């Protein structure tokens, strides 16, 4: 009564789950980084060859 | 009192959500509306690299 019922925290994170939240750029920024690194590597290799 | 003619009880009233789905705006939902511009910019940049 005085801890679980009186409290303000519902102990069920099973109903009303995570709604549609789009893909962040944090999963995409590291891919952009290796893209730019491969571009610069290819530029320098083409210049020295 | 007489016999009850109409039975009733306690019910739940909600906002009654409809199928409010937009059109062309629903297509560019899942990734972003701003990562695609960087994708097209990297596309034209890699084409500049190839040319």
Swiss-Prot record, chain A:
Induction: Down-regulated in the pyramidal cell layer of CA1 in the hippocampus by global ischemia. This is Glutamate receptor 2. It is found in: Cell membrane; Postsynaptic cell membrane; Postsynaptic density membrane. The chain holds residues 786 to 834 of 883 of the full protein. The lineage of its organism: Eukaryota, Metazoa, Chordata, Craniata, Vertebrata. The chain crosses the membrane at residues 28-48. The M4 transmembrane segment mediates tetramerization and is required for cell surface expression. The postsynaptic actions of L-glutamate are mediated by a variety of receptors that are named according to their selective agonists. This receptor binds AMPA (quisqualate) > L-glutamate > kainate. Ionotropic glutamate receptor that functions as a ligand-gated cation channel, gated by L-glutamate and glutamatergic agonists such as alpha-amino-3-hydroxy-5-methyl-4-isoxazolepropionic acid (AMPA), quisqualic acid, and kainic acid. L-glutamate acts as an excitatory neurotransmitter at many synapses in the central nervous system and plays an important role in fast excitatory synaptic transmission. Palmitoylated. Depalmitoylated upon L-glutamate stimulation. Ubiquitinated by RNF167, leading to its degradation. Belongs to the glutamate-gated ion channel (TC 1.A.10.1) family. GRIA2 subfamily. Detected in forebrain. Detected in dendrites of neuronal cells. Expressed in the pyramidal cell layers of CA1 and CA3 and in the granule cell layer of the dentate gyrus. It comes from Rattus norvegicus (Rat). Homotetramer or heterotetramer of pore-forming glutamate receptor subunits. Tetramers may be formed by the dimerization of dimers. May interact with MPP4. Forms a ternary complex with GRIP1 and CSPG4. Interacts with ATAD1 in an ATP-dependent manner. ATAD1-catalyzed ATP hydrolysis disrupts binding to ATAD1 and to GRIP1 and leads to AMPAR complex disassembly. Interacts with GRIP2. Interacts with GRIP1. Interacts with NSF via its C-terminus. Interacts with CACNG2, PICK1 and GRIP2. Interacts with GRIA1 and SYNDIG1. Part of a complex containing GRIA2, NSF and NAPA and/or NAPB.
Swiss-Prot record, chain B:
Coiled coil: none annotated. It comes from the Eukaryota. The chain crosses the membrane at residues 33-51. Detected in cerebellum (at protein level). Palmitoylated. Depalmitoylated by CPT1C and upon L-glutamate stimulation. It is found in: Cell membrane; Endoplasmic reticulum membrane; Postsynaptic cell membrane; Postsynaptic density membrane. Homotetramer or heterotetramer of pore-forming glutamate receptor subunits; heteromeric assembly can be the result of both receptor subtype and flip-flop forms and according the composition, one partner can be dominant with respect to the fast desensitizing current component, whereas the other can determine the steady-state component. Tetramers may be formed by the dimerization of dimers. Found in a complex with GRIA2, GRIA3, GRIA4, CNIH2, CNIH3, CACNG2, CACNG3, CACNG4, CACNG5, CACNG7 and CACNG8. Interacts with HIP1 and RASGRF2. Interacts with SYNDIG1 and GRIA2. The M4 transmembrane segment mediates tetramerization and is required for cell surface expression. Belongs to the glutamate-gated ion channel (TC 1.A.10.1) family. GRIA1 subfamily. Ionotropic glutamate receptor that functions as a ligand-gated cation channel, gated by L-glutamate and glutamatergic agonists such as alpha-amino-3-hydroxy-5-methyl-4-isoxazolepropionic acid (AMPA), quisqualic acid, and kainic acid. L-glutamate acts as an excitatory neurotransmitter at many synapses in the central nervous system. The postsynaptic actions of L-glutamate are mediated by a variety of receptors that are named according to their selective agonists. This receptor binds AMPA (quisqualate) > L-glutamate > kainate. This is Glutamate receptor 1. It comes from Rattus norvegicus (Rat). The chain holds residues 505 to 555 of 907 of the full protein.
């Amino acid at each position: 009564k005085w801890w679980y019922d009186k409290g303000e925290c519902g102990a069920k994170d099973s109903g009303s789950k995570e709604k549609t939240s789009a893909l962040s750029l944090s999963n995409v920024a590291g891919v952009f980084y290796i893209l730019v690194g491969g571009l610069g590597l290819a530029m320098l290799v083409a210049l020295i060859e | 009192f007489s016999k009850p003619f109409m039975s009733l009880g306690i019910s739940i009233m909600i906002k009654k959500p409809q199928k409010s789905k937009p059109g062309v705006f629903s297509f560019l939902d899942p990734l972003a509306y701003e990562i695609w511009m960087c994708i097209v910019f990297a596309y034209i940049g890699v084409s500049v690299v190839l040319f």
